[PDB]
Amino acid sequence: EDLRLHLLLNTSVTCNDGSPAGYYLKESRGSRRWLLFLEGGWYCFNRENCDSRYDTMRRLMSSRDWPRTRTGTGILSSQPEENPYWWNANMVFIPYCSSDVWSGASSKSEKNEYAFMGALIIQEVVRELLGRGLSGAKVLLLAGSSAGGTGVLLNVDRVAEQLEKLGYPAIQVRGLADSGWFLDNKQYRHTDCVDTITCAPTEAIRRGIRYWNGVVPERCRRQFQEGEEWNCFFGYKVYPTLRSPVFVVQWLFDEAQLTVDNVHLPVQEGLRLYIQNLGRELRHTLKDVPASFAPACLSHEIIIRSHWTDVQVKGTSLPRALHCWDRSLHTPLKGCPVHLVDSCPWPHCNPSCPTG
Numbered sequence: 308e309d310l311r312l313h314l315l316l317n318t319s320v321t322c323n324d325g326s327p328a329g330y331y332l333k334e335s336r337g338s339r340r341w342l343l344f345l346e347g348g349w350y351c352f353n354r355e356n357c358d359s360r361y362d363t364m365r366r367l368m369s370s371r372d373w374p375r376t377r378t379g380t381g382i383l384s385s386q387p388e389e390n391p392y393w394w395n396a397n398m399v400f401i402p403y404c405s406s407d408v409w410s411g412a413s414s415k416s417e418k419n420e421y422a423f424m425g426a427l428i429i430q431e432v433v434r435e436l437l438g439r440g441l442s443g444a445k446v447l448l449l450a451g452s453s454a455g456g457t458g459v460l461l462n463v464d465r466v467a468e469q470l471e472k473l474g475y476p477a478i479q480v481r482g483l484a485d486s487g488w489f490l491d492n493k494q495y496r497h498t499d500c501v502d503t504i505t506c507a508p509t510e511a512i513r514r515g516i517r518y519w520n521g522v523v524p525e526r527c528r529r530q531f532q533e534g535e536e537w538n539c540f541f542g543y544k545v546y547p548t549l550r551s552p553v554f555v556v557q558w559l560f561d562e563a564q565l566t567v568d569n570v571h572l573p574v575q576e577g578l579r580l581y582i583q584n585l586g587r588e589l590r591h592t593l594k595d596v597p598a599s600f601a602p603a604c605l606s607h608e609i610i611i612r613s614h615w616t617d618v619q620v621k622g623t624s625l626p627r628a629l630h631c632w633d634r635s636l637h638t639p640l641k642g643c644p645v646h647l648v649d650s651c652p653w654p655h656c657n658p659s660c661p662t663g
């Protein structure tokens with residue numbers, strides 16, 4: 308229970324139900340590294356599915372029941388045994404209570420049953436942390452898992468711009484996007500968007516942006532233009548538009564990707580080819596991503612799991628790869644790689660994959 312809750316002092320920046328958003332913080336004095344982690348947990352995109360999420364996933368829509376502390380795990384752990392990478396950093400966990408993939412900029416009002424303020428929550432957390440020691444930082448790593456990983460891609464350059472505009476151009480802003488790199492690929496079985504479960508992420512996100520007043524990074528917005536901003540939620544399309552260094556962690560056979568592809572796991576030829584092609588497409592999208600870790604496993608998220616150190620690609624663990632990334636940001640480094648993508652073509656062809 309080492310990270311302590313702070314509700315935002317600006318109480319106009321709210322969770323979905325208008326309760327104040329917030330963050331959990333464990334300071335490390337004398338460290339100039341700050342890790343801000345964005346929680347995940349899917350999204351909702353219309354009144355009916357947001358109402359259902361409010362009934363049974365209320366902690367993802369409200370701060371009213373949040374505990375006063377949370378325990379840091381994985382990359383948020385302060386113990387070097389669990390976190391070889393950044394155990395001495397200042398740790399921040401930002402709960403996901405906006406259901407908008409961290410993209411929204413709309414308040415609850417006479418027009419809006421819910422507030423979708425994800426993009427403003429991140430900005431407000433950064434602003435309030437500056438007065439709690441972030442002003443002295445050398446590196447701010449914005450990390451996140453699942454929808455929080457996509458949220459890194461959507462917001463890392465805006466955090467960089469915010470700090471520059473606030474007069475902190477020496478803080479190096481970097482991103483770590485875990486399990487947020489999705490493909491707008493053909494589904495294995497096909498359903499028109501006629502309700503929540505049948506609606507593919509491209510259609511659900513196009514609807515969500517309008518419902519949330521969702522915002523995307525400026526260079527990506529300028530490429531795709533009005534009505535096409537949903538493209539910016541897909542990592543392989545938004546990443547090339549970003550300026551901040553971003554390390555991409557993505558299982559090749561991500562369970563959430565398979566879910567949105569209508570795959571539910573003896574596998575016959577059509578599905579075998581489908582799965583193999585998914586891994587091949589994911590690997591292709593990462594070919595020119597220099598800092599990446601993409602194991603051939605059927606799983607979902609990694610960085611805040613306590614056993615995150617166990618998986619390796621080509622003999623290198625993720626904490627090692629992240630350390631090599633830090634060194635690279637001081638020509639490639641002898642024995643300390645940063646681009647680690649499996650080439651074997653089937654889930655758990657890597658023996659270090661999580662056991663489940």
Ligand SMILES: *[C@@H]1O[C@H](CO)[C@@H](O)[C@H](O)[C@H]1NC(C)=O
Nearest residue numbers: 317318319320427428430431
């Ligand atoms: C509070 O947050 C809102 C929404 O982002 C912003 O417009 C406003 O300037 C903030 N107010 C203060 C006092 O920081």
